[PDB]
């Protein structure tokens, strides 16, 4: 399935994911596509910071949901 990751630095990324994918997996895919190290990535959905051990389905992240990526 497809989700969007808006960054604050002007790119909006598309990701191919499964609801079963963990946040760690998603950060891995963001690294693979953009070269941003997972340890620098903070993901936000509905004002909530996503945690590595959890999945997209855990946060009720749906097809074409939008995540915000903020860097530390």
């Amino acid at each position: 399935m497809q989700i969007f990751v808006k960054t604050l630095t002007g790119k909006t990324i598309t990701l191919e994911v499964e609801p079963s994918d963990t946040i760690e997996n998603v950060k891995a895919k963001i690294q693979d596509k953009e070269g941003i190290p997972p340890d620098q990535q903070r993901l936000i959905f509905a004002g909530k910071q996503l945690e590595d051990g959890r999945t997209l389905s855990d946060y009720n992240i749906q097809k074409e949901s939008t995540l915000h990526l903020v860097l530390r």
């Binding site: 969007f4 808006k6 960054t7 604050l8 002007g10 790119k11 909006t12 990324i13 598309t14 509905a46 074409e64 949901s65 939008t66």
Partner: protein, 326 residues
């Protein structure tokens, strides 16, 4: 590079509502031509910056830049016309009306912009059958509510122009055909049942249809309609065909439209993302004035898309060009 395609647009801080709209407007060559005529310094920054972006977004030959900076337009908006905050999400439809009205205001500071049409508004009292003066109201878009088996664009249009009855409407006529009552004497103002109906009056060269996906629940909360609304590449409006804009005025397939862009909202009732499906820019030696190729554009990211994908999407704003009369 973006060889067979168009530049993307930087997202300048939750500005997908602007980028999606720009990509849609860029697929309306009549609007571009109008703006070109129109644009030929702070007060005109909006139209100049909009013109520059649309031109760069409607070029058959790829330009020097893969991704464009819509900063002059955003600045003109935020500072001079629509004082929105820097990082807040907005409605592309609301931006659309800001742009058409701002451009018309630059104008009256001369043909109307090609999104402009007119509705006809007819109403009559059921008690005395006196017909009210006809209202001929401008529109820049058609905001269609979605009825509640799949829903079609045609059902939305049909619902839009269908007649309705409205109760407790003032009728001066029935008020004066009313006997007074000896109390002094009181004459009760007569409120009656009226039939009312909107019809399509003047049709624009560029058509913006707004599908109202955000509504109000019975429980008093906003809800987003996610369901598909079936629409077509070609739209005939022949089926759906004094006071003008409040001012008393004087009054004394033919309407075939071709889809050029579909702006899509992804998300819930409170927030999300906007993307745009759009035709490629017209080619000089095409066999049609329009390109048969489609693109999907999400801010900076541009890719080719199929018409199947376009038609299967969740349309929010639909953009059409009127095809030359028969």
């Amino acid at each position: 590079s973006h060889m067979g395609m168009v530049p993307g647009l930087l997202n300048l801080g939750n500005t997908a509502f602007m980028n999606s709209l720009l990509q849609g407007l860029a697929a309306c060559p009549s609007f571009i031509r109008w703006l070109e005529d129109f644009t030929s310094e702070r007060e005109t920054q909006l139209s100049r910056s909009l013109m520059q972006l649309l031109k760069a977004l409607s070029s058959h030959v790829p330009g020097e830049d893969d991704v464009l900076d819509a900063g002059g337009l955003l600045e003109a908006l935020r500072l001079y016309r629509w004082h929105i905050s820097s990082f807040e999400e907005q409605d592309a439809h609301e931006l659309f009306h800001v742009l058409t009205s701002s451009l018309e205001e630059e104008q009256e500071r001369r043909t109307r912009h090609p999104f402009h049409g007119r509705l006809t508004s007819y109403m009559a009292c059921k008690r005395c059958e006196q017909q009210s003066p006809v209202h001929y109201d401008s529109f820049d878009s058609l905001s269609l509510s979605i009825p509640s088996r799949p829903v079609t664009l045609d059902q939305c249009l049909q619902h839009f122009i269908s007649s309705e009855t409205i109760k407790e409407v003032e009728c001066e006529n029935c008020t004066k055909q009313q006997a007074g009552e000896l109390v002094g004497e009181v004459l009760e103002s007569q409120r009656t049942t009226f039939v009312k109906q909107l019809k399509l009056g003047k049709l624009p060269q560029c058509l913006c249809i707004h599908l109202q996906r955000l509504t109000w629940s019975k429980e008093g909360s906003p809800i987003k309609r996610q369901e598909h609304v079936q629409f077509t590449e070609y739209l005939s409006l022949d089926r759906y065909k004094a006071i003008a804009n409040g001012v008393d005025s004087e009054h004394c397939s033919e309407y075939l439209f071709r889809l050029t862009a579909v702006l899509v909202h992804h998300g819930d009732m409170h927030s999300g993302h906007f993307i745009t499906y759009r035709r490629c820019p017209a080619a000089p030696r095409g066999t049609s004035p329009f390109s048969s190729q489609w693109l999907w554009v999400s801010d900076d990211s541009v890719r080719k898309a199929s018409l199947q994908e376009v038609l299967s999407s969740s349309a929010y704003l639909l953009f059409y060009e009127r095809m030359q009369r028969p």
